[PDB]
Amino acid sequence: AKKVQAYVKLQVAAGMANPSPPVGPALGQQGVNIMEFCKAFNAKTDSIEKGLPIPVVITVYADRSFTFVTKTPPAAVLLKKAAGIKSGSGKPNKDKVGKISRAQLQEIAQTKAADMTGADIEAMTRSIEGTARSMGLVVED
Amino acid sequence: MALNLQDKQAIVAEVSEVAKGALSAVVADSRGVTVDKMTELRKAGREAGVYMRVVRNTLLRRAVEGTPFECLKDAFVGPTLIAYSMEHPGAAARLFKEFAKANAKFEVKAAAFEGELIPASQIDRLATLPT
Amino acid sequence: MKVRASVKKLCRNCKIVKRDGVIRVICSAEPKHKQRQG
Amino acid sequence: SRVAKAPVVVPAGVDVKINGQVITIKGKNGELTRTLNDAVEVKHADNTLTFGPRDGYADGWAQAGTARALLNSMVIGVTEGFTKKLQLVGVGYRAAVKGNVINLSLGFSHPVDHQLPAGITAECPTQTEIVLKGADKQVIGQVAADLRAYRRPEPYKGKGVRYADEVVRTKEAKKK
RNA sequence: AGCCAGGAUGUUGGCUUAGAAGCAGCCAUCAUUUAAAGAAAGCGUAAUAGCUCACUGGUCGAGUCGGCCUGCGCGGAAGA
């Protein structure tokens, strides 16, 4: 991934391909061939989860050489995964949705902490914990 | 910043840890970006953790006030961009010529780092490491 | 130029000057904030 | 007043004449002279030049700081010489020089020929660019303003005489 | 106050998810990483981005910033 002239952060849908009213010309204004991106990403969908708002970090080079950097889905949508309650903020502090624990959430935090940018893996889960009541969730303790 | 002791609570915290430490270096970034700090303290994130210091307080009487407490000869390091690299674990530890890689790595000039106390020398490459 | 009786800084970049006994407002960012009087 | 306290340092060879309030500077590029306001005490007294408020004048330190930065850029002009760089962006715009006369073609029905004052040396590196040099910082800004005043940088296609460093802010056509 | 640097990582934050991507309207506004950087300050975009900005380093070297109460002034102020 090069510097920012065509550098974007994208991928509303991971399990769904080419969401043109979500993304469409969000990178098509930069004009990158996303047809080489998707079937490559279908070969990047060999191992992990499906049908989820998983983001991406895309920068291309000068001569159509393309590059994606995907990560784990955001901590605001990590609450909908390990808990099974696909809702969020709206107005979160008086929105009651549900509650799972630090010991339930940490199973998918066993993988993503190296995928995230930190050295404290006990505190990169706290990037979901303070996100939780910012998306209307409680944490079991 | 706050009042007098709050300006100097880190200056009495400057030398409390290098009272049991002995060696350090110099880093600065007049071009490098946050991914330098995010990953060269991930270098600290694999060495010890957080408090491998990258503090930038070499103002003309700020670290110079913290200088006569410990390692008296570093009063001439008062001019332009200097950050003190505090490391305890290991006599002549890992972070000794990985700064020489950092001359190439992403922080294009590292403020002409050279290393000050206990090689008993200025400029001389730091290569005699007890691993 | 908005002539007024009460000029005020609207942009962050708006500046108050006092050319020739008249109080102007000059905004380098926006030309619609160019005001004078008062 | 910070600029009034910081003195200017005259380099080698640059002459200084102080017969009261008239100040004459002779240098390598040329010879500038400037009479100051009657509220400053400029004291050579050394190599360098310091500036002080004369007695009684309420804006003494106000007139002092403008006395410095005048004579500061005055001693820069006789040594290095100031350069203004202009640019003719726009289709079918030409610039050329014939001595002290700049010939411009800015899409009018007649050519505009601006005659430079004594002290300006304009040349054209290309046909769409004006670079001119001179001693006095004031007088090359004034003649750069006059060349910009012929055809200002309109805010739609950016056409017009502009400064080389000057940024221009464009708009869009309304809706259709 | 300039000047030389960083200004990010989670995270399009679920959402009005048609998208608002730190930048319309919701409500949160916590955590990584810290020298510090705001799920964001404004500009600019259909949507990004660009761009600076707070914040945070270096230099330089001293006062500086914003309210309050008042004295006297300025604009507001065009007619046969």
From Swiss-Prot, chain A:
UniProt keyword Ribosomal protein, yes or no: yes
Keyword GTP-binding: no
Modified residues (N,N,N-trimethylalanine): 1
Keywords: Methylation, Ribonucleoprotein, Ribosomal protein, RNA-binding, rRNA-binding
Modification sites for N6-succinyllysine: 71, 80
SUPFAM superfamilies: Ribosomal L11/L12e N-terminal domain, Ribosomal protein L11, C-terminal domain
GO molecular function per UniProt: large ribosomal subunit rRNA binding; rRNA binding; structural constituent of ribosome
Domain of life: Bacteria
Gene Ontology process terms (BP): cytoplasmic translation; ribosomal large subunit assembly; stringent response; translation; translational termination
Entry-linked InterPro entries: Ribosomal_uL11 (IPR000911), Ribosomal_uL11_bac-typ (IPR006519), Ribosomal_uL11_C (IPR020783), Ribosomal_uL11_C_sf (IPR036769), Ribosomal_uL11_CS (IPR020785), Ribosomal_uL11_N (IPR020784), Ribosomal_uL11_N_sf (IPR036796)
A single GO cellular-component term on record: cytosolic large ribosomal subunit
Record-listed N6,N6,N6-trimethyllysine modification sites: 3, 39
Recorded family membership: Belongs to the universal ribosomal protein uL11 family.
Subunit structure: Part of the ribosomal stalk of the 50S ribosomal subunit. Interacts with L10 and the large rRNA to form the base of the stalk. L10 forms an elongated spine to which 2 L12 dimers bind in a sequential fashion forming a pentameric L10(L12)2(L12)2 complex.
Role description: Forms part of the ribosomal stalk which helps the ribosome interact with GTP-bound translation factors.
Protein name: Large ribosomal subunit protein uL11
Protein source organism: Escherichia coli (strain K12)
Name of the coding gene: rplK
From Swiss-Prot, chain B:
N6-acetyllysine sites (modified residues): 37, 105
Acetylation as UniProt keyword: yes
GO molecular function, one term: ribosome binding
An annotated GO cellular component: cytosolic large ribosomal subunit
Keywords from the UniProt entry: Acetylation, Repressor, Ribonucleoprotein, Ribosomal protein, RNA-binding, rRNA-binding, Translation regulation
A single GO BP: negative regulation of translation
Functional description taken from the UniProt entry: Forms part of the ribosomal stalk, playing a central role in the interaction of the ribosome with GTP-bound translation factors.
Family: Belongs to the universal ribosomal protein uL10 family.
Binding partners and assembly: Part of the ribosomal stalk of the 50S ribosomal subunit. The N-terminus interacts with L11 and the large rRNA to form the base of the stalk. The C-terminus forms an elongated spine to which 2 L12 dimers bind in a sequential fashion forming a pentameric L10(L12)(L12)2 complex. Two L12 dimers associate with a copy of L10 to form a very strong complex (called L8).
Note: Ribosomal protein L8 appears to be an aggregate of ribosomal proteins L7/L12 and L10.
Full protein name: Large ribosomal subunit protein uL10
Record lineage: Bacteria, Pseudomonadati, Pseudomonadota, Gammaproteobacteria, Enterobacterales
Gene: rplJ
Parent sequence residues shown: 1 to 131 of 165
Curated annotation (Swiss-Prot), chain C:
Transmembrane stretches, start-end: none
Key word Amino-acid biosynthesis present: no
Record-annotated disulphide pairs: none
One GO biological process term: translation
PROSITE patterns: RIBOSOMAL_L36
One GO MF term: rRNA binding
Annotated InterPro entries: Ribosomal_bL36, Ribosomal_bL36_sp
One cellular component term from this protein's GO annotations in UniProt: cytoplasm
Keywords: Ribonucleoprotein, Ribosomal protein, RNA-binding, rRNA-binding
Assembly and binders: Part of the 50S ribosomal subunit.
Family listed: Belongs to the bacterial ribosomal protein bL36 family.
Chain's role: One of the last ribosomal proteins to be assembled in the 50S subunit, it contacts a number of helices in the 23S rRNA, acting as molecular glue. The simultaneous presence of uL16 and bL36 probably triggers ObgE's GTPase activity and eventual dissociation from the mature 50S ribosomal subunit.
Name of the protein this chain belongs to: Large ribosomal subunit protein bL36A
Source organism per UniProt: Escherichia coli (strain K12)
Swiss-Prot record, chain D:
SS bond partners: none
PROSITE patterns noted in UniProt: RIBOSOMAL_L6_1 (PS00525)
Keyword Ribonucleoprotein set for record: yes
GO cellular component: cytoplasm; cytosol; cytosolic large ribosomal subunit
Keyword Ligase: no
A GO molecular-function descriptor: structural constituent of ribosome
Subunit structure: Part of the 50S ribosomal subunit.
PANTHER family (alphabetical): 60S/50S RIBOSOMAL PROTEIN L6/L9 (PTHR11655), LARGE RIBOSOMAL SUBUNIT PROTEIN UL6M (PTHR11655:SF14)
Protein name: Large ribosomal subunit protein uL6
